[PDB]
Ligand binder design. Structure first.
Ligand SMILES: Nc1ncnc2c1ncn2[C@@H]1O[C@H](COP(=O)(O)OP(=O)(O)O)[C@@H](O)[C@H]1O
Ligand SMILES: Nc1ncnc2c1ncn2[C@@H]1O[C@H](COP(=O)(O)OP(=O)(O)O)[C@@H](O)[C@H]1O
Ligand SMILES: Nc1ncnc2c1ncn2[C@@H]1O[C@H](COP(=O)(O)OP(=O)(O)O)[C@@H](O)[C@H]1O
Ligand SMILES: [Mg+2]
Ligand SMILES: [Mg+2]
Ligand SMILES: [Mg+2]
Lengths: 515, 515, 515
């Protein structure tokens, strides 16, 4: 491989690359803007050692004392239903509410799993509130204590707007101690001095400084039954989430996944990409037809279409190839369905009719031929009725209205399509038509699916295959050619159909307007 | 190899891959949900050293003292018959039962192996219970002590539902001490401080905390004849089993075993996969017939089957190959049995009869021919009776009912099949039939097994081999061709039969419906 | 690749290389001259240890004491609207202003984000000033204190020119302490001695020395409730930005980006560069025409142009190639539009007419032919009107004025250009003209876009393609030749047009003046 190939591949897949990178970067931005910020407070302690003091600070006696002093076993969480409600509320500038609770005693359900009882408190005004544990609604008032239904509560100084809801949990003392220990750090910072740096993290910048001051006071008071050089203050800039590294990670991750996905698609492609793939195998390509982005004949509705220009190129190529052919019959076939055989056949018939030659178009697709719909029809008396013997050769020929050539439709779909085509009446029809017309074009079903084209091809002096631009593979076309050669039918060459513009190609068609 | 191959192989084997990975992941989930959880308790001790204290804590004097205090030599296990009964009971929310036993003395059988006597106690109510050691049933009551049959028991505070059974074992003191020592850990956690961290694991979160408190008290009391900073508490989250790592391991193990199994099957395949394998060796393939998923002729029951379409393709190929043949006799044979020789022969005869040609089908498989069953028969007077001389050429020919061609059945199975076929009456029959029919098709046994086809092939102007899609190998077909060539029989080519859709193939047949 | 190639590439791209390097170096110089200089002060302290003193110096008690003493919570910033205003003002020699403020109390808005209140003070004279916080304009006087609108201010010794504006911020004490800590360093410098080196950086060389003296005095005074060997002095040479390394980095970065960009363009080029690329494929090149940097015929306006000399070379080559041609008709075509087909065709006609031969020029580009504009026209009765039958062969021929040859214009643009050219009247016209002229030159549309040239080429004894020097590729020309060969038209060879001078080429044309 070379760099031009990969650059063209990136240019072609730019829509997917951009979409994937933008999606990943949007998710990264949403996380870096909706994650709750985490602040850090710290304090500095003087030791007159300092290895066992580190274990004494993190022990459950000191931390438990702090938790008892500060009532850290009463967890209060402002309620937002979604997982992004809190982040949005912070972004909108809404001030978070808080409640001071000095006494809480839940009935302590203490079942197998839920060791932490919790209730929901809804604020009705600055004074009263509603409480529900499991649907049991009670009304309480700030100030006066509540002792009802096995529930004790004392609420002071509700500072929020009415309608807010708060989850109040009474978690066990060990759970509180473990929570405090997880966010608490002690370090020496000199490895030999009596200086210890205590650190604490949390989402409330005032609460963490109060908690660290309590820890320092408890440790100092316990030791004298040590000097606090720096009492706890909180850095106002949150330490998490780290926004810029998150966004950079998101962008780079999006780019790498996009690149590997494009590499995956490029390594898994097998369709035809240029006429050179067919010409390596030894197959003549007579034209490349682009997709016309424009029940009508294209060569009649839009004669100045680019696909019709490419078909005029095919017309001039054929006028030279079909010299020294045994008769004036051309058969168009292909490997797979919806490659474009009917499109090519009918539009070629129209462009050859505009030059003043008499053209007969035969729809010999007895299984799915729709040419009568595309030309305007009297669907009675098609090729079926003629072959089965219930029609004559003069009742089946009709005129294309905006075209200028004659045609024969398929007729009624028969039960034995391949066997009807083997009747000698088919060759009688071809020999009769070959004397009243300058050209006969026969449209057929694909050869890999059924065998009708190989029957028809015995009486055609020229045979061309239609290959679809991206769908078909080189192996398909080669197998189709060999299946034709085995039945005694020589295939003159190929027509590539439905070509589109690709930056990776480096093959230049003339698929652009000139005028 | 290239990535497209391996991706196609994975697509083809996806059923096996998915099944294996799902089985392994289900087993991993069952283990991670049924393994008994193991909790951890820990405590913190202050040393005013700390290297020999680690050996003193783990010594048998202190641990034995703890065991004597807590009666850890009385093992009580709630009885579940299966190895998943306890896990299911925990999952169903059933509360485990417990019994407080303060005095236990089993008769101490003390045989060669079973040093641990054990009895089974069945709860009948909150007060009384039944006891059985070796079938000896006794009744006891909570409170009053039991001294009977050399068995002493004192049970207090049965807390369970009636019908529960408990195994009560009296294990030796050293066994209890070793059990305690296995789950007990001591560490320094500072490597120089007087701080020791004691840890204990077990399935009962309260029992382990009691045991660790007992150990700490015994060590402290013995030393003063040390400060306990943190008494034992249990982390409520079990430390084992670690569910997520178990499930991840199960998934990754399933994926790796699936991949190696698929790689094993791919490296061990030798059958034919595409007509290109036969065409490399120099063998013409005239058709590829798919499996028809539809005692009847397929070309008559379901004429619009895909296999019948492929056989019409073979019919058109043969109409061109059999030109310039010495006579109108076609022989179908093959390498191995049940490749499809009778299927191809009979369905080809039907599709050639629908085109209005007179066809004779001869079942020259004198060893296992069943064509008379498939056509509707008068089994008398087949080819056997004609060759052996006890029938004429006009009594053996019959009509296929839904077909449209004549046929000759095998007749009665003879004892000398190969020698009957060598009679000049066989060539007389063929020469007579060659003037009353347009085509004669002869179905034969496989050539690797027996030699009858090589005898028949002397009088056939065309001979084709049938290769089964996945069963046969290229070597088999080449050996069959060479065995035919050695006997003076030229094989025109091959028919691949029973082809199916494979994502790894990258060879495109036309085996899809068009209509 | 070899060194001559890369050197030629650099010579060719020197304009881009120089421009990019100069841009990057200009940006580096602008940064190294506009970044605010940062000075460094330092002091030396004697310790009679020195590990905990390092943590005591950087603690918030000592630094906070310094900030309280020096009023470092009053931030004063001289206001420049742009991000380069301060640098320009320093470069112009303008002396920065300063104000001594001893008392500041802002109303402390203290909203969600803006924790730092700030006001703007505009100097009106040496005595009075104007103050605005949020549009509230107040007048104050140096000396007398201001207590108005919840704002307290005391300003002393305004030393600046009138019209200056200063931002006065009251940042929080922790923010001031963090700012001081970020620019403050302590080191031991001997790792064992009682010598400590204190360092401080900042943009004001006097303020930082005062701050470091305050820190040293506070630490010394606190310890005695230590010897200061060196009091703080400031190095007069700024430590940042480091100009020379910045400029060197800019230059080297510019060079590397230029080199990679030129390498990118060289690896992405696919156009034709020399006639050897076409001659490898087997295509005869008959001339290489340079760009003429000079609605007129070039061979008439500037006959001594270099392009006309190259066209005289083509004339002599053609006089030898067109011997043994079937007729005296030459067709010029090409692959893509604006390759130069009309330029070559018309100028070749002029140079052949000056030698005394009778020349007919036919503009057979019925879609975009403009030759009538370039020759001076009576636009009526062109080739369209003749082919459609509404004009005779004697009314369509006109004289080029400054030329010397006859010509036929296209006529009115028809709706069916390709089909008009297929009329037998075209061959009648060519056969009639072939007897009254020595040479007929036909100009055509490009062959990849439309098919008209392949129709015209049947009646031309000689056909040449024009390839554009850098635009066309070898693949394009080869595809054009093969499209012509498929239609039965033999292409004699190619003309390379619009060649320019490239140092990387190492192919020498004769494109220089001789005279
Ligand atoms: N180059 C093309 N540009 C635009 N439409 C096309 C082109 N080729 C085929 N088609 C349209 O795509 C559809 C499928 O092609 P069709 O010719 O009918 O398939 P088939 O090969 O089975 O005969 C048709 O509706 C056809 O008109
Ligand atoms: N492509 C096929 N699709 C469906 N059934 C098939 C196909 N080929 C063979 N069979 C069936 O499989 C069985 C074995 O094949 P058969 O022709 O009787 O074997 P043999 O080669 O020994 O003569 C038969 O019952 C046949 O009808
Ligand atoms: N070697 C050249 N030097 C200067 N001008 C040129 C040269 N070749 C072509 N041109 C001018 O560039 C323009 C495009 O070329 P033109 O011959 O008209 O294109 P086309 O190939 O489509 O017929 C014209 O205006 C032409 O005069
Ligand atoms: Mg079709
Ligand atoms: Mg059989
Ligand atoms: Mg032009």
């Amino acid at each position: 491989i070379d760099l031009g190939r990969v650059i063209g591949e990136l240019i072609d897949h730019r829509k997917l690359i951009i979409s994937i990178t933008s999606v990943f970067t949007l998710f990264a931005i949403l996380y870096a803007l909706l994650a709750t910020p985490i602040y850090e407070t710290d304090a500095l302690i003087q030791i007159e050692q300092s290895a066992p003091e580190t274990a004494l600070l993190q022990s459950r006696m000191i931390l438990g004392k702090t938790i008892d002093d500060l009532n850290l076993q009463i967890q209060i969480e402002q309620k937002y239903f979604p997982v992004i409600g809190r982040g949005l509320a912070r972004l909108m500038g809404e001030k978070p509410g808080n409640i001071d609770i000095t006494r809480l005693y839940l009935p302590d359900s203490d079942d197998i799993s839920n060791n932490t009882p919790s209730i929901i408190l809804t604020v009705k005004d600055k004074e009263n509130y509603s409480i529900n544990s499991d649907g049991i609604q009670l009304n309480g008032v700030v100030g006066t204590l509540l002792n009802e239904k096995g529930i004790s509560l004392l609420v002071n100084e509700i500072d929020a707007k009415p309608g807010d809801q708060f989850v109040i949990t009474q978690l066990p003392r060990l759970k509180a101690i473990s929570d405090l220990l997880k966010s608490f750090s002690v370090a020496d910072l000199g490895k030999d001095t009596g200086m210890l740096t205590l650190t604490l993290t949390g989402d409330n910048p005032k609460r963490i400084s109060h908690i660290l001051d309590s820890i320092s006071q408890n440790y100092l008071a316990q030791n004298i039954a040590v000097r606090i050089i720096d009492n706890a203050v909180t850095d106002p800039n949150p330490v998490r989430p780290k926004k810029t590294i998150i966004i950079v990670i998101g962008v780079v991750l999006g780019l790498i996944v996009s690149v590997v996905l494009v590499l995956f698609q490029v390594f898994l492609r097998r369709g035809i990409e240029s006429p050179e793939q067919l010409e390596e195998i030894g197959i003549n390509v007579y034209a490349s037809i682009p997709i016309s982005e424009w029940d009508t004949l294209l060569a009649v509705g839009n004669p100045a279409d680019l696909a019709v220009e490419a078909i005029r190129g095919l017309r001039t190529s054929l006028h030279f190839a079909m010299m020294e052919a045994k008769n004036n019959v051309l058969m168009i076939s292909g490997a797979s369905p919806s490659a474009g055989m009917t499109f090519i056949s009918s539009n070629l018939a129209a462009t050859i009719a505009i030059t003043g030659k008499k053209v007969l178009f035969i729809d010999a697709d007895l299984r799915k031929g729709y040419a009568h719909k595309m030309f305007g029809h009297k669907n009675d008396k098609g090729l079926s009725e003629f072959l089965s013997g219930q029609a004559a050769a003069e009742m089946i020929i009709d005129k294309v209205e905006g075209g200028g050539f004659d045609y024969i439709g398929r007729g009624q779909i028969p039960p034995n399509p391949a066997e009807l085509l083997m009747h000698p009446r088919f060759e009688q029809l071809l020999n009769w038509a070959s004397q009243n017309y300058d050209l006969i074009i026969i449209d057929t079903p694909p050869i890999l699916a059924v065998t009708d084209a190989a029957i028809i091809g015995r009486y055609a002096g020229t045979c061309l295959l239609v290959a679809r631009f991206e769908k078909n593979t080189v192996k398909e076309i080669d197998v189709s050619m060999k299946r034709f050669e085995q039945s005694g039918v020589v295939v003159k060459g190929c027509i590539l159909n439905g070509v589109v513009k690709k930056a990776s190609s480096y093959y230049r068609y003339g698929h652009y307007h000139y005028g």
